[PDB]
Write a protein that binds this ligand. Sequence first.
Ligand SMILES: CCCCCCCCCCCO[C@@H]1O[C@H](CO)[C@@H](O[C@H]2O[C@H](CO)[C@@H](O)[C@H](O)[C@H]2O)[C@H](O)[C@H]1O
Lengths: 605, 467
Amino acid sequence: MALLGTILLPLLGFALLGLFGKRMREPLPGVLASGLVLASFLLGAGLLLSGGARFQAEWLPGIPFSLLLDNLSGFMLLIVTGVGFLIHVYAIGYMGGDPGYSRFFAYFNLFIAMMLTLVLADSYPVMFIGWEGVGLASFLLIGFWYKNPQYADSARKAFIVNRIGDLGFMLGMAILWALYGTLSISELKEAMEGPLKNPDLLALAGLLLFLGAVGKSAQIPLMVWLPDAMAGPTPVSALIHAATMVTAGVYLIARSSFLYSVLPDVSYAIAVVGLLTAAYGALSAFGQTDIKKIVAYSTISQLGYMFLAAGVGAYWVALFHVFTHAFFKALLFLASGSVIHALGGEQDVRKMGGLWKHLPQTRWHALIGALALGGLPLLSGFWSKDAILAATLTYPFGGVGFYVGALLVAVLTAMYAMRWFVLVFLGEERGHHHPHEAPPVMLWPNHLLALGSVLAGYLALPHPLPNVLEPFLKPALAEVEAHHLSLGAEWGLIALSAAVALLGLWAGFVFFQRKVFPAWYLAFEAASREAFYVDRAYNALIVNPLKALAEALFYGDRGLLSGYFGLGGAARSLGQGLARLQTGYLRVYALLFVLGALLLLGVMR
Amino acid sequence: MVVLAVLLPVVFGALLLLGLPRALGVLGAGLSFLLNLYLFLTHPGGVAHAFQAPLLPGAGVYWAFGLDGLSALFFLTIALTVFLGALVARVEGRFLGLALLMEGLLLGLFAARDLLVFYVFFEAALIPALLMLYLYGGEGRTRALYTFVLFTLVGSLPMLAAVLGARLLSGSPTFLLEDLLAHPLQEEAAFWVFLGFALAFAIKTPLFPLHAWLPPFHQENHPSGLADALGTLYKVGVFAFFRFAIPLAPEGFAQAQGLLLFLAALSALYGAWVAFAAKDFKTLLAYAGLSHMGVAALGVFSGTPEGAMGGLYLLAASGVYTGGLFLLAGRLYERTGTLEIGRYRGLAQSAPGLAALALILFLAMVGLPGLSGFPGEFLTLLGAYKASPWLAALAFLSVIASAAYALTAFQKTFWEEGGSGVKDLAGAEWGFALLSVLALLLMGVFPGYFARGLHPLAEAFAKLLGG
Ligand SMILES: CCCCCCCCCCCO[C@@H]1O[C@H](CO)[C@@H](O[C@H]2O[C@H](CO)[C@@H](O)[C@H](O)[C@H]2O)[C@H](O)[C@H]1O
C-alpha cells in the first residue's frame, strides 16, 4: 500500500495541475511537483531501507496487479525519482513566464508516476501500463508547445514509433502466457527454473520483448524517433534521455535476465544491436549542427553501450552505466538548457562559441559533463565504460569482436564530446546577451549533478578495489553468469581505457577548434548531420507507401460498396425485366398463361 | 426487475415522441441509467431476474428475460452511453424519444432469454435506427438508409430460416435458449443453422466484406451523432455469435471458424489502416469501429475463455468511448460547423481541457492501458494467440494504425495553430466529461469488477467447444 504511495503521489499531484493548475501563482506547480517527487524518492527510499516492499491486488482474472520493490527496483526508483527531482527543481527555473506551467508539471508528475509504475511492477501487463504510460507522457511533453506543427509531429512520431515496439512487447507477453500461464515476473522466473520448454518459442518471446525494448531505448531500427524528441522544453529532453524512458529499455532486459540468460542465440543479437546502435549513433553524432541533437545522438550511442553490456550477459554492469549516464546526461542537457536560457533559445553551434568568460559556472558544468561522457580516467563514465569493455571479453558470448568496436566507439565518443564543448564554449563569439541570468534554481540542482557525475564512478571499482554495486544488484535479479578474470591483465585494460580516453579527448580538443575541415569532414558533416540518410530511407518504402496504402484501401472500400450497389442494380434490372413481361397485350397474357399451366402441369405427376 | 428496466426507456421515449419536452426524457435516460447501474451492483449469478410469460405458446414462443454477468454489464454500458447522449444531445428535435425507444429495444435485445424474442428485438430496433436516419439528417439520408436497412435485413430474414431450423431439426419443445441447448443439432444441420446465424451476425458485426453499410450510415445521421452512438450499440453481432450462433450449432462453427478468425483479423487491421485516410470524424470513427469489432470478433471466434471474455468486454467498453467520440465530434461540430478534420485547426487554448476529454477518449480507443479498450484488447490477444498466432499478429498490426489515425486526427483537430476560438464547456458537457472519464478510468483500472460475471460464461462457453 505504501509502495503504491510512491506511484500515487506524482498522480494525486498530477491531477491537481490538470484539474486546477491555472488556479495557482507561478512558482507553485513546480514546488508541488518537485515536492511529491521529493516525497516519492524519500518515502520510497524509506521502504527500500526497510528492506523492500510489495503490493498485490485485484485485476483481470489470472493476471493480478503486482508491485515489487527489491534492490533492482529500488536502484531504478532512486535514479528516476532523484535525478527526476533535481530536473523538476531546475524546470521550475527554466520554465518561467511560460503559460502551461500547470500543464508542464502535471505532465511531469504523470511521467514520473508512469515510470515508477514501470519499474515497480511484478507482472508484465502492469509494466505495460508503465511502458505505454511513459510513452504517452513523452508524447504530451515533446509536443508541449503545441502551437507548432513541427512540435506536434515530433510527439506523433514518438507515440507511434514507440508503439511499434510496444506491439512486440504485447506479442512476447502473450507467448509467455500460452507457454507458462502466469505473466508475473517473479513466478515467471521461478517457473523458468528447470529444462524450460519449447526453447525456440521462448527465444521468440524474448526476441519480441527485445524488439519492444528497441523502441523505448531508441536502439536501431527504431532509433529514428529519439532525435526528433528534442522538440519539447530542454529539461524534458533531460528526463527522457537520462533518468527515465530509455532507461526502461535496459531495465526490461535486466528484469527479464532470467529469460535472456538461457538464450545464447538471442543475447548475441542483443549485444550486436547494442554495438551497432553505439557506433551508428556516435558516427552520426558530431555531424549535428545543433546543441540539442548532437547530445541526443550521444544518448542513442551510450544506450547502445548499455545494450551491448546487457547483451553479453553482464546485467549489473549495464545498470552501473545506466546510473553514471543518468547523472552526466542530465548534467549535459540541463547545462545546454541554461546555455540557451542565456541566449534566448539560440540553440545553434556554428552560431555559438566563446561562452567561457561571460558564463560563470556553466562552463564548469558542461566541462565536467562532456569529460564524463568522454570518459575522463577519474570520472563516472570512465569506470562504467571500462567495466563494460572488460565485461565484453570476460563474459560468455565472445566479446573479442565486440571489444575492439566498443573501443573505437570509445574514441569517437571522446571526439564528439570535445567537438561539442569546443564549438560551444571556445573560438570567438557570435550573437548578443547580457548579464548572467543563470539563476539559483537552475545552476543549483545542476551543480549537484556534477558532483554525482564525478563520484558515481567508484560505486563499482574493479575486482580487488571495493565494489558495492554488484552485491546490491545481483541478489535481486540476474544471478546466473560465468566470468573469468585476471588481475593486472584487467588493469592493462583499465589503463588502456584511460590512455585511449585521454588521447581521444585531447585529439578532439584541437581537431574541432581547427577552422579548416578538408575534403571529407564535408563528406562527414553532411551524412552525420543527416544521420547517414536513414530517415530519408525510412520514408522510402516504409512510411509513405503505407500512408499511400491508406488512401488506396479507402478508395478500394468505396469500390466494394459500389459493387454492392451493383447488386442492387442487378435486382433492379432483373426486376424491370420481369415487369417488362407485361406488355398490355392480352394475346401475350394468354400465351404466357397457357405456357405457365403447361409448366405447373409438367412438374407434378 | 428486468422488464421494468427494458420498458423504462421505451415508455419514457414514447412519452417523449408525442408528449415532450426533452428534460423529462433526459431524466428518463438518467433513471434508466441509475436502475441499470443498480442492477449491475447486485446480482449473484447467471439467472438473475428471470421472466417468463406466454406470447405465442403452441409456437413455442415466450417472453423470456434475465441478466447474465454479460447482460448486466451491457445494461450498464448502454444505459450509460445513451444517457451521456441524452444530457449532451444538442439533437433534441424531441426524437430523443426515438433514441430511448431504441435503447429499450436494445436492452430487450440483450435480456432476451429465448431465440424468437431475440429475433423480434434484433429486427425491431431497426425501426428507430432507420427513422432517426431518415427524418433527422444527412444529404444522402436515403441511400445510407436503404443500404443499411437492406443489408441488415438481407442478412436477417434468412436467419429466420435458421432460427426455425434450430428448434425444428433439434426437436426442441420451445424457443427458450435453455431448451434449444438441451437439444443439439447434428452435422449438416448444425452447419446450415450456424451459417444462417452467421451471415446475419457477420454482416451485423461487421466482418470485412460485409461492412460496406457502415460508413454511409455514420455519415448521414444528424451531425451531432447521437444516432451514431446508438447505431454503434446496435453493433450487437459479436454478442449474437457468442450467445446464440455458436452454442446452438457448434459443429458448423467448427468448420467456419478458420474463416471467421481470418475475417475478424483482417477486419481489425484493414479498418484501422484505412481509418487514417478519413477526412471527417464520422468516417474515421466508423472505420475505427470496424477495427474494434474486428478485434472483439477475433476474441470470440478463438474458443479460449480468455479471448471470449476479452472480446465481450471490448465490445461493452468500446460502446462508451465510441459513442462518446461520436457525441464529442458532434459537440465540436455544433461550435464549428463541420466534421472535417483539417479545417479549423488549433482548438486547444481556445477550448479548455476539452482537449483533455477528447484525448482521454482517443487513448481509450487506441487502447492505452488504464483505459477501457486495453483490457478487452489484451485478453483478446491472449486468446487469439492461443487460437491462431499468425492471425493474432496480423490483426494486432493494428495498435500502430490506431495510434496513427487517433493522434493524427487529434493533432489536426486540437493541437495546431490557434483558430477563431470557441466556447469552453457547457454545464451539460461537464457532466459528460466527468461521468465519461470516470467510466473509462473505472473500466480501465478495475476491469476486475466489470467482467467478473463474464468469467463463468467465458470458460463454460469455451468448454462448449471442448468435449
Ligand atoms: C479522480 C479525479 C480525476 C483526475 C484526473 C484529471 C486530469 C485532467 C488533466 C488532463 C490534461 O490537462 C491539461 O491541463 C489544462 C487543464 O485545463 C489545459 O491547459 C490550459 O490551462 C493551463 C493551465 O496552466 C494553461 O496554462 C494552458 O495554456 C491551457 O492550455 C490543457 O488543455 C490540458 O490538456
